[PDB]
Amino acid sequence: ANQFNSAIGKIQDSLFSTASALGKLQDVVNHNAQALNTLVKQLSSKFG
Amino acid sequence: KCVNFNFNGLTGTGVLTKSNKKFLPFQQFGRDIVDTTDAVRDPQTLEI
Ligand SMILES: *[C@@H]1O[C@H](CO)[C@@H](O[C@@H]2O[C@H](CO)[C@@H](O)[C@H](O)[C@H]2NC(C)=O)[C@H](O)[C@H]1NC(C)=O
Numbered sequence: 404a405n406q407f408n409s410a411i412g413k414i415q416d417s418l419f420s421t422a423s424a425l426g427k428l429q430d431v432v433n434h435n436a437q438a439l440n441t442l443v444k445q446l447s448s449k450f451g
Numbered sequence: 452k453c454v455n456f457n458f459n460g461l462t463g464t465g466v467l468t469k470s471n472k473k474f475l476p477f478q479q480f481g482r483d484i485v486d487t488t489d490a491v492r493d494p495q496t497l498e499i
Pocket residue numbers: 494495496497
């Protein structure tokens with residue numbers, strides 16, 4: 404029980420300090436926002 | 452009110468509201484990061 408409690412306490416630090424993962428959800432959000440922004444920005448192109 | 456506005460040759464359709472943006476004196480209009488027009492200076496009363 405003590406070992407599990409220590410690990411679950413360290414969880415709140417290992418999730419936001421060591422980084423590694425948790426960047427994939429941010430990657431999804433960034434990719435969708437960037438695609439939408441590019442789609443809007445394509446309206447300013449002359450295309451010849 | 453949603454109107455078709457023509458400000459000094461810049462033509463569009465939208466609703467106009469009073470702005471807290473502070474244009475530089477030479478600036479006539481402004482646009483977003485995606486280059487969509489967002490604020491227009493009125494050439495008569497110099498209001499944004
Ligand atoms: C455009 O013309 C008007 C005069 O027709 C200029 O001055 C305005 O005059 C009215 C007269 O009732 C005043 O109430 C406004 O306050 C005046 N406007 C300003 C901005 O001072 C007006 O300035 C002219 N626009 C210009 C020169 O850009």
